[PDB]
Amino acid sequence: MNLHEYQAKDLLESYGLKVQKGIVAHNPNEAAQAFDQLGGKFAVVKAQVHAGGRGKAGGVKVVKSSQETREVAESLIGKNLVTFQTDAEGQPVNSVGVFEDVYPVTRELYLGAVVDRSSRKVTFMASTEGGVDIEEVAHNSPEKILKVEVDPLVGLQPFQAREVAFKLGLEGKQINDFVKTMLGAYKAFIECDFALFEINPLAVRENGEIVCVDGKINLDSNALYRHPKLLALRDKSQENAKELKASEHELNYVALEGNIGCMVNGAGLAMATMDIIQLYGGKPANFLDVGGGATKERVIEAFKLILDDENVKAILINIFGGIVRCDMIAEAIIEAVKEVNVTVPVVVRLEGNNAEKGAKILADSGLKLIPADGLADAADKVVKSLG
Amino acid sequence: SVLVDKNTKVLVQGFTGKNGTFHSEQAIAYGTNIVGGVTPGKGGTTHLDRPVFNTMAEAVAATGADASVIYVPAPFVKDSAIEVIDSGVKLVVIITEGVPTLDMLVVKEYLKDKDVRVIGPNCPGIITPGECKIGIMPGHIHMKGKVGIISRSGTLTYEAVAQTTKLGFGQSTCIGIGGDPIPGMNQIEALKLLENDPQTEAIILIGEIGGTAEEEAAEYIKHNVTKPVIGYIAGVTAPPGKRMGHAGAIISGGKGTAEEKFAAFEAAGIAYTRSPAEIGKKLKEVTGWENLY
Ligand SMILES: CC(C)(COP(=O)(O)OP(=O)(O)OC[C@H]1O[C@@H](n2cnc3c(N)ncnc32)[C@H](O)[C@@H]1OP(=O)(O)O)[C@@H](O)C(=O)NCCC(=O)NCCS
Ligand SMILES: [Mg+2]
């Protein structure tokens, strides 16, 4: 789960980090009022969407009056914002944040952390190169990315943050403020089950304060059962409508650009199926994992997800029945097809438990289902069904 | 075979639950020795004509179990895993999906000085065909044989099992290490075990997008595994920055792609196929194994 900028800032502030503070406005009058509430010569209005690249797309404006703020909010709220990091539909702007001006500044840093899968440790990364995409820095000048691996027993220690502060060339109170920033981020990371966070830029203001200007936090969604206050931050408007809908029916769905839909049990096998389709000249239109014990109802919802894409011209159902009998699965597929408008050829590969009794039921259902023997057969046939 | 055989005595955590019940019935029918299980609040009852205990300590004292399988919901898995680690059981299989990453980070660290192997979470478990199954995999597609299998996936593993069964090679032990970002048992741990198992004459390594485990396993194989390894990687067509079902199946910071995994197998002299249909067939080519049947 991603957080909005204002939510990430509120969370980090609660662990003692300093942030560029703002006020959230859901309409232009509220935005104008925020500007006057902040009481500064300048404010920065920012579309609240789960995406970077907001400024390039027109979603970040400096303003000097309530009037300018209302104008900017009116321009943004209720339209979708497309950025280099969104899909082509963009993200809905239901609110803007009106933020205090914290510039000019002395310098900008990068600070972030991930769970590193190779070391199996929470790992912090810091750089003098704030306000640069850190991927570019990593690729071009890896030596500028400082890394701190945290030991799970002891956690992040002040000496590790000081090592970083000295290598960043911080001075004076900047060192102790940076140390407190890193320690607070670590506490948040564990206490909130972060998956990752980035603060970029982490500004060193003219008075030496260390301030989070823009920040992203991705939470481990699988831990949100134990964080009710974080689950309450969820903004479903920022999630893909089909991905979200699939989740509500115990399905896992991702859209691609292609013309052959797929319906598979198990994530490994779903990705393998997409891959063999492409090997045989097809273009997979989607990932879809129907899970174990796919019912009629669940297969109906899978059909609707796939065929909602006009570009889909054939479907491959590939199910490896182990504990569930293949003839029972064939029954559920047939019942599902009978309730849905299925306008394209459907190739069905059913393997494992009673593959034979299942294949026959499909063959005699009178729905023009194209039965396939192995994985290679199934790919070959679904691509061929395109003509 | 490795880790499990006909002598393995298995306890079930979440024994009385829906999946614990169903998979335990199947396991008993298969020939696995299920000696009982644990469900707090049902201690002193019986289930599937086996004892139920409130605690793993009581269970292990009563049964001398040496393995445990966990079917408890995600919120209780860290608790259940530490409980069985502390109990004297040497092998733990965790089926459950949705365990927080930071819970496995701590569990994996806790294991570092222990004499306990943990397989999973988010995995179908471990099977020594003809001897013992611990997990949710269908026994009937397997056959006692000579191919060891290590895989991050569930049903994709069953395709490699189907292919090696049909070619008449069969399986020594199949280890589903699971789909999560921090597994309890990684590929190298499993490769070491199979390299040392005389029943295993060849190894299939199945992976997918995310992490660098396959690349690290490649480097390890190059220098340390003498048996032929056949690789396959799912998710060539996966879009970047998207969870493909499994928590660990995600490309991010342009890393964890399928192609860099194939290329690592390349550089290490490890044979692989690009088609999931041709895993067995590639193994056949590499081994020169033949049988008119
Ligand atoms: C683990 C999982 C199977 C459990 O689902 P389930 O069997 O439907 O759940 P149930 O609630 O019926 O049973 C769970 C049992 O755990 C018990 N339990 C809870 N905490 C426990 C603990 N600390 N120790 C032992 N047992 C415990 C519960 O009391 C319950 O038993 P009961 O119903 O007699 O009370 C499910 O949460 C899950 O992860 N499913 C996906 C598994 C998967 O796909 N894995 C990857 C395969 S490749
Ligand atoms: Mg799965």
XYZ file of C-alpha atoms and ligand atoms in Angstrom:
729
model
C 0.000 0.000 0.000
C 1.247 3.455 -0.963
C 0.646 6.595 1.105
C -0.097 10.101 -0.055
C 2.627 12.729 0.457
C 0.653 14.353 3.286
C 0.023 10.973 4.982
C 3.733 9.997 4.717
C 4.686 13.370 6.203
C 2.122 13.034 9.056
C 3.533 9.551 9.818
C 7.178 10.651 9.746
C 6.411 13.766 11.817
C 4.892 11.501 14.490
C 8.310 9.762 14.811
C 9.978 13.157 15.342
C 11.209 13.941 11.795
C 10.823 17.481 10.489
C 8.656 17.890 7.385
C 7.536 20.498 4.925
C 4.072 20.859 6.518
C 0.842 21.356 4.549
C -2.959 21.449 4.649
C -5.144 19.125 2.592
C -7.950 20.689 0.582
C -10.735 18.779 -1.213
C -12.092 21.844 -3.041
C -10.721 25.175 -4.379
C -12.259 27.307 -1.555
C -10.599 24.986 1.016
C -7.287 25.422 -0.902
C -7.574 29.270 -0.883
C -8.331 29.070 2.891
C -5.265 26.889 3.489
C -3.018 29.483 1.862
C -4.261 32.191 4.248
C -3.999 29.712 7.186
C -0.275 29.054 6.444
C 0.297 32.865 6.366
C 3.437 32.881 4.193
C 4.432 34.946 1.175
C 4.657 31.711 -0.891
C 3.103 28.245 -0.663
C 3.435 25.179 -2.829
C 0.232 23.529 -4.045
C 0.654 19.795 -4.808
C -1.800 17.306 -6.322
C -2.142 14.367 -3.871
C -1.720 11.279 -6.071
C 0.287 8.085 -5.589
C 2.883 8.907 -8.158
C 6.125 10.789 -8.746
C 6.626 13.198 -11.667
C 3.745 15.367 -10.429
C 5.528 18.695 -11.162
C 6.458 17.866 -14.779
C 2.762 16.967 -15.308
C 1.501 20.350 -13.973
C 0.528 19.143 -10.495
C 2.952 21.337 -8.441
C 2.703 25.139 -8.456
C 4.197 27.861 -6.328
C 1.528 30.445 -5.354
C 1.580 33.861 -3.617
C -2.143 34.454 -2.977
C -5.334 32.664 -1.914
C -6.611 33.604 -5.383
C -3.717 31.884 -7.199
C -4.209 28.874 -4.883
C -7.928 28.613 -5.709
C -7.047 28.857 -9.391
C -4.475 26.070 -9.125
C -6.762 23.827 -7.029
C -9.634 24.442 -9.440
C -7.324 23.451 -12.316
C -6.308 20.148 -10.616
C -9.130 18.758 -8.438
C -11.531 16.357 -10.164
C -9.250 15.648 -13.177
C -6.820 12.695 -13.476
C -3.091 13.497 -13.507
C -0.922 11.514 -15.905
C 2.764 11.435 -14.959
C 5.789 9.515 -16.325
C 5.044 7.075 -13.391
C 1.273 6.517 -13.980
C -0.491 4.453 -16.668
C -2.125 6.379 -19.513
C -5.370 7.087 -17.560
C -3.377 8.739 -14.738
C -4.432 9.053 -11.085
C -7.502 10.921 -9.836
C -6.839 14.192 -8.044
C -9.408 14.385 -5.273
C -7.347 16.736 -3.146
C -4.362 19.036 -3.166
C -1.982 19.803 -0.364
C -1.057 23.443 0.296
C 2.456 23.367 1.766
C 4.647 25.857 3.614
C 7.649 27.236 1.715
C 10.936 25.903 3.181
C 13.309 27.244 0.478
C 15.864 28.462 -0.179
C 18.015 25.671 1.300
C 21.758 24.971 1.716
C 21.712 21.504 0.036
C 19.529 18.427 -0.689
C 20.182 14.863 0.406
C 18.666 11.459 -0.344
C 17.630 9.065 2.432
C 15.742 5.779 2.019
C 15.482 2.162 3.111
C 14.374 -1.244 1.786
C 14.234 -4.795 3.033
C 17.231 -6.170 1.126
C 16.368 -9.675 -0.013
C 19.971 -10.867 -0.538
C 21.249 -9.822 2.944
C 17.789 -10.392 4.574
C 18.264 -7.079 6.456
C 16.674 -3.681 6.571
C 19.135 -1.515 4.608
C 19.391 2.276 4.532
C 20.736 4.251 1.605
C 21.855 7.880 1.713
C 23.502 10.256 -0.736
C 24.701 13.815 -1.223
C 22.754 13.611 -4.477
C 19.304 14.757 -3.305
C 16.858 15.970 -6.006
C 18.385 13.467 -8.487
C 16.633 10.229 -9.383
C 18.600 7.867 -7.172
C 18.396 5.036 -9.824
C 20.461 7.253 -12.149
C 22.922 7.936 -9.316
C 23.113 4.200 -8.521
C 23.831 3.296 -12.170
C 26.265 6.156 -13.026
C 28.009 6.797 -9.669
C 27.385 3.829 -7.297
C 30.165 5.158 -5.001
C 27.865 8.078 -4.034
C 25.255 5.753 -2.502
C 26.123 5.097 1.167
C 24.552 1.898 2.591
C 23.923 0.822 6.186
C 22.780 -2.730 6.897
C 20.849 -2.944 10.174
C 21.351 -5.817 12.605
C 17.891 -7.058 13.734
C 18.902 -7.514 17.395
C 20.488 -4.106 18.030
C 18.721 -2.027 15.384
C 20.164 1.112 13.881
C 22.752 2.602 16.184
C 23.722 6.303 16.368
C 27.320 5.470 15.285
C 26.023 4.066 11.951
C 24.070 7.254 11.268
C 27.127 9.347 12.279
C 29.332 7.379 9.812
C 26.868 8.430 7.090
C 26.594 12.058 8.368
C 30.406 12.451 8.214
C 30.636 10.937 4.706
C 27.845 13.332 3.587
C 29.980 16.264 4.904
C 27.350 17.404 7.374
C 28.523 19.852 10.053
C 27.388 21.213 13.380
C 23.849 20.520 14.525
C 23.198 19.015 11.040
C 24.960 15.824 12.220
C 22.815 15.278 15.318
C 19.623 16.218 13.409
C 20.489 13.756 10.642
C 21.199 11.030 13.228
C 17.811 11.648 14.892
C 16.176 11.614 11.429
C 17.687 8.199 10.554
C 16.899 6.700 13.993
C 13.283 7.893 13.802
C 12.930 6.521 10.269
C 14.163 3.101 11.469
C 11.702 3.081 14.352
C 8.890 3.935 11.918
C 10.085 1.327 9.450
C 9.750 -1.509 11.971
C 6.761 -0.189 13.891
C 4.691 0.430 10.721
C 5.917 -2.540 8.631
C 7.253 -0.364 5.887
C 8.365 -2.221 2.726
C 10.324 0.852 1.639
C 10.579 4.588 1.991
C 12.402 7.406 0.276
C 12.858 10.996 1.304
C 14.034 12.946 -1.752
C 14.811 15.706 -1.167
C 15.824 15.660 2.463
C 16.698 19.364 2.590
C 19.350 20.984 4.785
C 17.699 24.404 5.312
C 19.797 27.678 5.676
C 19.393 27.420 9.504
C 20.636 23.812 9.365
C 17.316 22.055 9.929
C 16.946 18.600 8.239
C 13.555 18.599 6.517
C 11.572 16.038 4.538
C 10.313 17.974 1.457
C 8.941 15.059 -0.577
C 8.623 11.512 0.681
C 7.144 8.185 -0.322
C 6.296 5.258 1.908
C 5.197 1.847 0.649
C 3.736 -0.315 3.459
C 3.686 -4.083 3.561
C -0.015 -4.628 2.766
C 0.181 -8.087 4.375
C 0.935 -6.449 7.768
C -1.983 -3.955 7.687
C -4.163 -6.366 9.805
C -2.092 -5.222 12.823
C -2.026 -1.450 11.933
C -5.665 -0.220 11.982
C -4.599 3.468 11.831
C -2.502 2.794 8.721
C -5.193 0.678 7.041
C -7.567 3.668 7.572
C -5.275 5.762 5.289
C -6.017 3.536 2.289
C -7.048 5.508 -0.819
C -8.759 3.042 -3.178
C -9.107 5.754 -5.863
C -5.333 5.400 -6.478
C -5.609 1.633 -7.128
C -6.389 0.174 -10.546
C -10.149 -0.513 -10.718
C -9.733 -4.030 -12.187
C -6.886 -5.020 -9.842
C -9.021 -3.868 -6.960
C -12.135 -5.648 -8.170
C -10.146 -8.903 -8.686
C -8.856 -8.669 -5.116
C -12.520 -8.541 -3.902
C -13.183 -11.951 -5.590
C -10.025 -13.771 -4.389
C -8.417 -13.185 -7.817
C -5.060 -11.574 -8.662
C -5.201 -9.623 -11.964
C -2.694 -7.459 -13.853
C -3.484 -5.958 -17.335
C -0.934 -6.008 -20.203
C -1.145 -4.809 -23.826
C -1.890 -7.937 -25.867
C -4.727 -9.900 -27.465
C -4.759 -13.300 -25.708
C -6.335 -13.408 -22.230
C -5.174 -16.029 -19.689
C -6.807 -17.636 -16.641
C -4.488 -19.828 -14.506
C -4.251 -21.277 -10.987
C -0.990 -20.244 -9.293
C 1.230 -17.191 -9.867
C 4.278 -19.120 -11.184
C 2.147 -21.019 -13.688
C 0.234 -17.820 -14.677
C 3.515 -16.057 -15.541
C 4.825 -19.237 -17.308
C 1.577 -19.376 -19.365
C 1.906 -15.729 -20.401
C 5.537 -16.522 -21.368
C 4.744 -19.600 -23.547
C 1.944 -17.682 -25.262
C 4.511 -15.089 -26.340
C 6.952 -17.868 -27.382
C 4.287 -19.175 -29.815
C 3.678 -15.726 -31.456
C 0.838 -14.419 -29.183
C 0.706 -11.291 -27.018
C -0.526 -12.034 -23.423
C -3.287 -9.545 -22.497
C -3.202 -10.169 -18.726
C -1.917 -12.002 -15.676
C -4.709 -13.727 -13.769
C -4.326 -16.160 -10.879
C -7.710 -17.756 -10.005
C -6.222 -19.462 -6.908
C -7.322 -22.895 -5.555
C -10.911 -24.232 -5.712
C -12.119 -21.821 -8.402
C -15.940 -21.814 -8.241
C -18.443 -20.934 -10.991
C -18.802 -17.446 -9.439
C -15.039 -16.888 -9.383
C -14.631 -18.027 -13.040
C -17.475 -15.643 -14.063
C -15.591 -12.726 -12.475
C -12.335 -13.855 -14.197
C -14.139 -13.868 -17.599
C -15.496 -10.373 -16.960
C -12.040 -9.011 -15.995
C -10.394 -10.452 -19.103
C -13.069 -9.578 -21.693
C -13.544 -6.027 -20.393
C -10.451 -5.527 -22.637
C -11.802 -5.080 -26.183
C -8.297 -6.059 -27.486
C -8.762 -9.630 -26.225
C -9.396 -11.918 -29.256
C -8.889 -15.367 -27.583
C -8.604 -16.807 -24.057
C -6.453 -19.656 -22.678
C -7.663 -21.309 -19.487
C -4.772 -23.353 -18.021
C -5.582 -25.090 -14.774
C -3.509 -27.780 -13.082
C -5.936 -29.588 -10.783
C -4.206 -31.457 -7.978
C -6.437 -31.682 -4.915
C -9.491 -30.494 -6.967
C -10.872 -32.913 -9.579
C -10.593 -31.792 -13.247
C -14.178 -32.868 -14.099
C -15.491 -30.637 -11.233
C -13.386 -27.731 -12.535
C -14.759 -28.407 -16.079
C -18.318 -28.224 -14.603
C -17.522 -24.790 -13.029
C -16.008 -23.481 -16.303
C -19.094 -24.632 -18.310
C -21.538 -23.080 -15.785
C -19.510 -19.867 -15.878
C -19.435 -19.640 -19.705
C -23.248 -20.024 -19.710
C -23.654 -16.811 -17.657
C -21.203 -14.584 -19.573
C -20.968 -13.190 -23.128
C -17.992 -15.201 -24.410
C -17.387 -13.845 -27.904
C -13.854 -15.172 -28.551
C -12.356 -18.674 -28.947
C -11.524 -20.306 -25.638
C -8.779 -22.940 -25.401
C -8.935 -25.016 -22.191
C -6.015 -27.019 -20.742
C -7.020 -29.106 -17.710
C -4.326 -31.337 -16.219
C -3.815 -33.516 -13.159
C -6.673 -35.043 -11.212
C -9.000 -36.791 -13.703
C -7.753 -34.741 -16.685
C -9.523 -37.283 -18.962
C -13.086 -37.164 -17.457
C -12.697 -33.324 -17.421
C -11.576 -33.049 -21.070
C -14.590 -35.119 -22.182
C -17.088 -32.996 -20.202
C -15.610 -29.917 -21.942
C -15.816 -31.669 -25.348
C -19.562 -32.505 -24.875
C -20.751 -29.169 -23.320
C -21.552 -27.729 -26.775
C -19.800 -24.397 -26.103
C -17.029 -24.761 -28.771
C -14.341 -25.007 -26.028
C -11.036 -26.043 -27.702
C -9.435 -28.798 -25.506
C -5.618 -28.881 -25.290
C -3.354 -31.664 -24.080
C -0.089 -30.130 -22.805
C 1.241 -26.646 -22.219
C 2.862 -26.503 -25.726
C -0.461 -27.668 -27.369
C -2.455 -25.003 -25.444
C -0.136 -22.117 -26.511
C -0.042 -23.337 -30.132
C -3.878 -23.579 -30.313
C -4.747 -20.255 -28.626
C -2.372 -18.269 -30.929
C -3.788 -20.184 -33.967
C -7.373 -19.226 -32.913
C -6.500 -15.543 -33.756
C -6.426 -16.546 -37.474
C 15.844 -38.321 -0.809
C 16.426 -35.484 1.627
C 14.793 -34.173 4.867
C 11.716 -36.456 4.812
C 11.102 -40.201 4.343
C 8.849 -43.029 5.606
C 10.261 -42.612 9.157
C 9.368 -38.896 9.386
C 6.822 -38.215 12.213
C 4.782 -35.086 11.443
C 2.793 -32.772 13.731
C 0.268 -30.325 12.318
C -0.101 -26.769 13.659
C -3.698 -25.640 12.874
C -4.640 -29.322 12.702
C -8.304 -28.836 13.451
C -8.770 -26.017 10.873
C -10.213 -26.429 7.406
C -6.962 -26.774 5.460
C -5.175 -28.560 8.265
C -7.956 -31.133 8.316
C -8.205 -31.597 4.570
C -4.455 -31.862 3.822
C -3.867 -34.059 6.893
C -6.556 -36.535 5.654
C -4.779 -36.663 2.288
C -1.353 -36.992 3.952
C -2.537 -39.943 6.075
C -4.048 -41.594 2.910
C -0.712 -40.971 1.105
C 1.349 -42.745 3.780
C 2.684 -39.748 5.751
C 2.891 -40.477 9.468
C 0.753 -37.683 10.986
C 1.210 -38.240 14.774
C -1.083 -35.431 15.961
C -1.319 -31.715 16.060
C -1.660 -28.506 17.908
C -4.610 -26.169 18.176
C -4.679 -23.994 21.316
C -7.960 -24.616 23.122
C -8.507 -28.173 21.809
C -5.738 -29.928 23.847
C -6.774 -33.428 25.022
C -9.201 -33.982 22.071
C -8.682 -36.194 19.051
C -8.924 -35.348 15.395
C -8.605 -37.801 12.463
C -7.998 -40.412 15.209
C -4.833 -38.598 16.357
C -4.094 -36.598 19.541
C -4.532 -32.844 19.713
C -2.349 -30.763 22.031
C -2.491 -27.197 23.303
C 1.253 -26.649 22.931
C 4.099 -27.899 20.716
C 6.109 -28.761 23.883
C 3.390 -31.247 25.039
C 3.020 -32.603 21.470
C 6.705 -33.234 20.957
C 7.077 -34.820 24.453
C 4.159 -37.195 23.651
C 5.016 -38.129 20.013
C 8.765 -37.571 19.435
C 7.720 -35.809 16.169
C 10.651 -34.578 14.080
C 8.693 -32.464 11.531
C 5.831 -29.952 11.677
C 3.635 -28.317 9.069
C 1.913 -24.962 9.736
C -1.607 -24.222 8.392
C -2.262 -21.278 10.759
C -3.467 -17.899 9.367
C -0.725 -15.287 8.626
C -1.169 -13.217 11.831
C -0.201 -16.208 13.998
C 2.643 -17.634 11.881
C 5.613 -15.840 13.543
C 4.332 -17.114 16.961
C 3.794 -20.693 15.604
C 7.175 -20.771 13.847
C 9.135 -19.699 16.946
C 7.083 -22.176 19.017
C 8.092 -25.116 16.816
C 11.702 -23.881 16.462
C 11.934 -23.935 20.287
C 10.272 -27.399 20.584
C 13.021 -29.793 19.345
C 11.385 -30.427 15.925
C 14.100 -30.275 13.191
C 11.972 -29.487 10.101
C 9.199 -26.966 9.731
C 7.043 -26.475 6.631
C 5.028 -23.236 6.485
C 2.201 -23.314 3.894
C 0.542 -20.021 4.903
C 0.432 -17.062 2.467
C 0.468 -13.406 3.600
C 3.130 -13.572 6.363
C 4.614 -10.050 6.849
C 8.073 -9.731 5.424
C 9.472 -8.330 8.687
C 8.130 -11.412 10.577
C 10.177 -13.732 8.320
C 13.174 -11.335 8.578
C 13.149 -11.913 12.352
C 12.411 -15.656 12.099
C 15.201 -16.174 9.561
C 17.646 -14.276 11.884
C 16.393 -16.330 14.883
C 17.217 -19.544 12.951
C 20.833 -18.638 12.363
C 22.169 -20.537 15.453
C 19.451 -23.203 15.605
C 19.486 -26.823 14.369
C 16.140 -26.360 12.552
C 15.258 -26.088 8.862
C 12.223 -24.029 7.866
C 10.644 -24.393 4.375
C 8.293 -21.609 3.272
C 6.211 -19.617 3.916
C 3.778 -19.343 0.960
C 4.862 -22.718 -0.417
C 3.316 -26.111 -1.265
C 5.836 -27.905 1.031
C 8.117 -30.928 0.532
C 7.519 -34.397 -0.906
C 9.667 -37.485 -1.140
C 7.459 -39.422 -3.571
C 6.615 -42.937 -2.363
C 7.609 -42.096 1.242
C 6.370 -38.812 2.772
C 4.449 -35.701 1.742
C 4.270 -32.570 3.928
C 2.092 -29.972 2.287
C -0.627 -29.473 -0.258
C 0.818 -31.010 -3.446
C -1.106 -33.861 -5.153
C 0.668 -37.173 -4.515
C -0.710 -38.945 -7.601
C 1.270 -36.823 -10.196
C 4.613 -37.735 -8.516
C 6.690 -40.945 -8.891
C 9.691 -42.172 -6.862
C 12.765 -41.402 -9.087
C 16.020 -39.495 -9.483
C 15.243 -35.813 -10.266
C 15.415 -33.343 -7.360
C 13.252 -30.230 -7.785
C 13.600 -26.743 -6.106
C 10.963 -24.147 -6.911
C 9.595 -20.769 -5.777
C 6.137 -21.636 -7.180
C 3.298 -24.091 -6.539
C 1.422 -25.298 -9.600
C 4.361 -24.423 -11.914
C 6.344 -27.019 -9.908
C 3.605 -29.591 -10.712
C 4.305 -29.116 -14.477
C 7.952 -30.054 -13.961
C 6.769 -33.019 -11.794
C 4.253 -34.083 -14.535
C 7.012 -33.843 -17.233
C 9.647 -35.826 -15.223
C 7.007 -38.441 -14.241
C 5.909 -38.876 -17.910
C 9.522 -39.233 -19.069
C 9.819 -42.059 -16.461
C 12.599 -40.306 -14.472
C 10.466 -39.500 -11.390
C 11.494 -37.368 -8.390
C 13.813 -37.883 -5.454
C 12.632 -34.951 -3.319
C 10.746 -31.825 -4.418
C 11.220 -28.723 -2.280
C 8.864 -25.799 -2.660
C 10.776 -22.966 -1.068
C 7.811 -20.566 -1.607
C 6.971 -17.239 -3.169
C 7.939 -14.822 -0.419
C 10.796 -12.205 -0.347
C 12.589 -13.870 2.590
C 12.091 -17.664 2.616
C 13.171 -19.805 5.558
C 15.179 -22.043 3.190
C 16.875 -20.514 0.144
C 17.968 -22.170 -3.139
C 21.601 -22.698 -2.046
C 20.517 -24.511 1.136
C 18.343 -26.818 -0.962
C 21.018 -27.316 -3.684
C 23.533 -28.374 -1.004
C 21.095 -31.055 0.241
C 20.328 -32.401 -3.243
C 24.031 -32.390 -4.314
C 24.689 -34.705 -1.285
C 21.694 -37.048 -1.910
C 22.658 -40.233 -3.901
C 19.006 -40.682 -5.029
C 19.167 -37.274 -6.832
C 20.954 -37.703 -10.208
C 19.830 -34.358 -11.646
C 18.251 -31.180 -10.356
C 15.576 -28.846 -11.725
C 15.739 -25.231 -10.460
C 12.544 -23.232 -11.087
C 12.496 -19.523 -10.388
C 10.725 -16.309 -11.287
C 11.082 -12.537 -11.312
C 12.208 -10.676 -8.176
C 15.286 -10.814 -5.974
C 18.749 -12.093 -7.023
C 18.506 -15.560 -5.519
C 18.746 -17.418 -8.892
C 21.894 -15.414 -9.844
C 23.497 -16.205 -6.476
C 22.457 -19.865 -6.839
C 24.012 -19.829 -10.324
C 27.397 -18.671 -8.914
C 27.166 -21.312 -6.185
C 26.319 -24.096 -8.693
C 29.237 -23.128 -10.956
C 31.763 -23.970 -8.195
C 29.970 -26.452 -5.889
C 27.312 -28.539 -7.725
C 28.539 -31.433 -9.903
C 25.117 -32.855 -10.788
C 23.439 -31.401 -13.927
C 21.100 -28.497 -13.130
C 18.274 -27.483 -15.507
C 16.822 -24.033 -14.934
C 13.592 -22.349 -15.899
C 12.473 -18.722 -15.027
C 8.814 -17.542 -15.191
C 7.907 -13.867 -15.839
C 9.674 -12.832 -19.024
C 6.485 -10.976 -19.996
C 5.815 -9.441 -16.518
C 5.441 -5.609 -16.397
C 7.902 -3.832 -14.035
C 6.882 -2.575 -10.579
C 3.896 -4.954 -10.233
C 3.305 -7.806 -7.772
C 2.586 -10.871 -9.924
C 0.576 -12.768 -7.273
C 3.442 -13.956 -5.054
C 4.748 -11.234 -2.692
C 8.316 -11.792 -3.960
C 7.449 -11.798 -7.701
C 8.125 -8.154 -8.597
C 10.665 -6.283 -10.764
C 11.841 -3.061 -9.093
C 14.811 -0.759 -9.634
C 14.991 -2.490 -13.079
C 16.300 -5.559 -11.254
C 14.782 -9.013 -10.678
C 14.034 -9.511 -14.395
C 13.745 -13.008 -15.892
C 16.359 -12.169 -18.567
C 19.145 -11.355 -16.110
C 18.407 -14.750 -14.499
C 18.683 -16.653 -17.815
C 21.885 -14.690 -18.560
C 23.323 -15.721 -15.152
C 22.613 -19.387 -15.923
C 24.342 -18.772 -19.266
C 27.489 -17.346 -17.658
C 27.666 -20.216 -15.151
C 27.367 -22.992 -17.798
C 23.976 -24.030 -16.362
C 21.529 -25.526 -18.852
C 18.044 -23.967 -19.048
C 14.925 -23.786 -21.134
C 12.832 -20.741 -22.070
C 9.619 -22.842 -22.402
C 7.814 -24.259 -19.308
C 6.662 -27.156 -21.497
C 10.292 -28.275 -22.200
C 11.766 -28.598 -18.663
C 11.730 -32.404 -18.725
C 12.804 -32.430 -22.369
C 15.805 -30.164 -21.643
C 16.774 -32.456 -18.753
C 16.509 -35.432 -21.170
C 18.851 -33.669 -23.660
C 21.380 -32.805 -20.970
C 21.423 -36.200 -19.291
C 21.143 -38.333 -22.418
C 18.651 -40.419 -20.429
C 16.487 -42.702 -22.616
C 13.722 -45.302 -22.263
C 11.439 -46.578 -25.119
C 8.759 -46.165 -22.422
C -2.983 -21.054 6.386
C -4.367 -21.104 5.755
C -4.366 -22.361 4.900
C -5.406 -21.293 6.834
O -6.724 -21.311 6.283
P -7.879 -22.275 6.962
O -7.420 -23.712 7.122
O -9.097 -21.904 6.098
O -8.158 -21.539 8.333
P -9.004 -22.084 9.559
O -9.382 -20.774 10.242
O -10.199 -22.978 9.207
O -7.946 -22.940 10.374
C -6.792 -22.348 11.001
C -6.618 -22.981 12.368
O -5.445 -22.433 12.962
C -5.651 -22.518 14.385
N -4.572 -21.758 15.032
C -4.577 -20.401 15.207
N -3.449 -20.020 15.847
C -2.715 -21.152 16.051
C -1.439 -21.437 16.689
N -0.710 -20.417 17.196
N -1.026 -22.753 16.714
C -1.737 -23.768 16.177
N -2.932 -23.591 15.620
C -3.480 -22.316 15.566
C -7.054 -21.937 14.529
O -7.640 -22.079 15.854
C -7.758 -22.723 13.400
O -8.256 -23.987 13.928
P -9.754 -24.150 14.392
O -10.630 -23.777 13.223
O -9.953 -25.563 14.940
O -9.886 -23.105 15.490
C -4.697 -19.806 5.003
O -4.691 -18.730 5.965
C -3.709 -19.557 3.871
O -2.596 -19.047 4.036
N -4.105 -19.968 2.663
C -3.231 -19.928 1.485
C -2.192 -21.044 1.512
C -1.413 -21.022 0.194
O -1.964 -20.753 -0.887
N -0.123 -21.284 0.303
C 0.752 -21.369 -0.821
C 0.528 -22.677 -1.506
S 1.753 -22.914 -2.817
Mg -0.219 -18.862 -4.877
